[PDB]
Structure formats: structure tokens, C-alpha cells
Amino acid sequence: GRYLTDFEPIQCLGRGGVVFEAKNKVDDCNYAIKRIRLPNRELAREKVMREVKALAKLEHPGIVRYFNAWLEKNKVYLYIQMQLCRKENLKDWMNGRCTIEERERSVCLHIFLQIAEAVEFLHSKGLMHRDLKPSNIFFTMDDVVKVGDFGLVGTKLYMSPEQIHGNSYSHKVDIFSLGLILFELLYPFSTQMERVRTLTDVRNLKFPPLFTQKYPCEYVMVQDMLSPSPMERPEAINIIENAVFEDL
Numbered sequence: 001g002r003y004l005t006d007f008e009p010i011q012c013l014g015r016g017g018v019v020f021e022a023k024n025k026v027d028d029c030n031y032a033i034k035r036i037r038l039p040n041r042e043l044a045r046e047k048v049m050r051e052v053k054a055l056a057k058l059e060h061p062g063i064v065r066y067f068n069a070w071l072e073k074n075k076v077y078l079y080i081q082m083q084l085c086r087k088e089n090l091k092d093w094m095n096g097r098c099t100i101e102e103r104e105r106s107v108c109l110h111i112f113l114q115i116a117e118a119v120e121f122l123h124s125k126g127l128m129h130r131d132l133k134p135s136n137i138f139f140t141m142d143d144v145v146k147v148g149d150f151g152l153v154g155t156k157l158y159m160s161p162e163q164i165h166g167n168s169y170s171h172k173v174d175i176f177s178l179g180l181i182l183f184e185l186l187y188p189f190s191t192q193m194e195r196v197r198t199l200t201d202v203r204n205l206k207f208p209p210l211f212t213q214k215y216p217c218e219y220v221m222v223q224d225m226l227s228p229s230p231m232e233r234p235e236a237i238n239i240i241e242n243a244v245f246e247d248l
């Protein structure tokens with residue numbers, strides 16, 4: 001139907017539903033289009049449709065721009081048309097910059113700040129992200145940082161304990177992810193294995209001595225954001241207003 005009639009597929013961008021890059025025939029722009037298999041049960045399906053109505057009202061510099069949502073009968077599919085972001089995500093970005101010198105403090109903090117501001121926005125709306133990790137943080141063609149796909153529903157490396165264990169949870173889950181991301185932005189790794197060895201240590205509040213001495217302030221921030229107890233993690237607003245971000 002509409003998808004095949006109105007768009008030309010270009011390439012698959014990810015699966016987990018699926019996300020395609022596709023060109024709209026009429027306006028000639030390329031878009032990221034997510035196809036989601038709709039639940040068969042009436043109640044579960046209504047939950048998804050309610051979430052679409054909420055998200056579609058969102059407008060913020062850190063949130064990917066929304067264009068359209070529609071259904072198609074195969075089982076029913078929900079299609080979501082978003083602005084196409086760059087192929088290089090934040091994971092790639094850090095992979096191409098494995099030395100301190102390639103990670104200018106200022107640039108790194110400005111990246112993180114945009115993420116935290118998008119998160120603060122969602123929390124203020126009574127929403128949470130739940131899936132914050134570098135492979136799911138994007139750049140626009142004009143280099144604006146975007147939190148990635150969320151709502152309407154991989155590595156657990158950035159996932160809070162309570163979220164991993166299926167315990168009751170709040171917006172505080174996003175703060176835990178932010179903590180690990182801030183550390184990772186400021187601490188380049190030589191190899192993939194070193195990355196995993198170190199991050200699993202950070203999760204458990206064991207930091208590289210070089211980091212604690214190079215970044216004493218970000219260090220206590222990260223420590224707080226990574227409290228195993230969610231009540232103890234700072235509000236996104238508190239993080240955004242931290243002194244470390246005062247040099248603009």
C-alpha cells in the first residue's frame with residue numbers, strides 16, 4: 001500500500017521492528033521509516049496507538065523530527081516516518097576518535113549536554129526514554145545531536161540494574177544511562193575489549209585512576225548518576241545545571 005506506492009526503498013538501517021531509509025517520490029527527500037508489527041490483541045494495540053498520539057505532539061531540538069504515522073493491513077503494520085539522521089551515530093563517532101586529543105573536553109560536554117537536555121524535556125512531560133546508548137544516539141545532517149528511537153514498546157551495558165532485573169522503575173533509569181555515556185564520551189578506548197572491560201567496571205563504580213584525576217568534577221557526577229539505588233540519582237535538571245557545563 002502507501003509505503004510501496006509513495007516511497008522508494010534505499011536501504012535497511014536497523015532491525016530489532018525494522019527501520020528503512022526511503023525516498024518519498026513526491027517530495028524527493030530521504031526519510032528513516034520504522035515498520036512495527038501491531039499486536040493482535042485489541043488492548044495491547046490500543047496501548048501502542050495511545051503512545052503514537054502522545055509522541056507525535058513532541059517538538060524539541062534533541063528529539064528526531066516527526067513527519068507521519070499510518071497503518072497498513074499485511075496482522076497489521078504501523079509505519080512511522082522520521083527525519084533521516086546521519087549514518088555515523090554516537091557509537092561510530094567515538095570509535096573513530098580513540099585518543100584523548102580526538103576527544104576535546106568542550107566538544108564532548110556539548111554533545112552530552114544536548115542529550116541530557118532532550119532527556120530533561122521528556123521527563124518534564126512525564127515520559128522516559130528507556131533506550132539511551134551510543135548506537136541509538138544520532139546526529140542530523142546539520143550536526144544537531146538527537147536521542148534515538150524510543151516508545152511504542154541489544155546490549156544491556158547502559159541499562160540500569162532495576163531495568164535489567166525487571167523491577168519497578170522510574171525516569172531515574174535514564175539517569176543511569178546518562179552517567180555511563182558521559183564517562184564514555186570523556187574516556188577513549190584503544191580496543192573493543194578494553195571498552196567492555198572498563199565500562200563494566202564503571203557500572204560497579206570502579207574508575208580508571210587517570211579519569212578521576214583528569215576529570216574530578218565529572219567523576220563525582222558520574223558516580224552519583226550510577227547509584228545502584230535510583231532515588232539517589234540526580235534529576236536531569238540538576239545535571240544540566242551542574243557547574244561542569246558553565247563554560248559555554
Ligand SMILES: Cn1cc(-c2ccc3c(c2)CCN3C(=O)Cc2cccc(C(F)(F)F)c2)c2c(N)ncnc21
Pocket residue numbers: 013014019032034051052053054055056057058063064065066068069080081082083084085086138147148149150151
Ligand atoms: C536507525 N535509525 C533509527 C532512527 C529512528 C530515530 C527516532 C525514531 C525512530 C527511528 C522511530 C520513532 N522515533 C522516535 O524518536 C520516537 C517518536 C518521536 C516523535 C513522534 C513519534 C510518533 F508519533 F510516535 F511517530 C515517535 C533513525 C533515524 N531517524 N535516522 C537515521 N537512522 C535511524
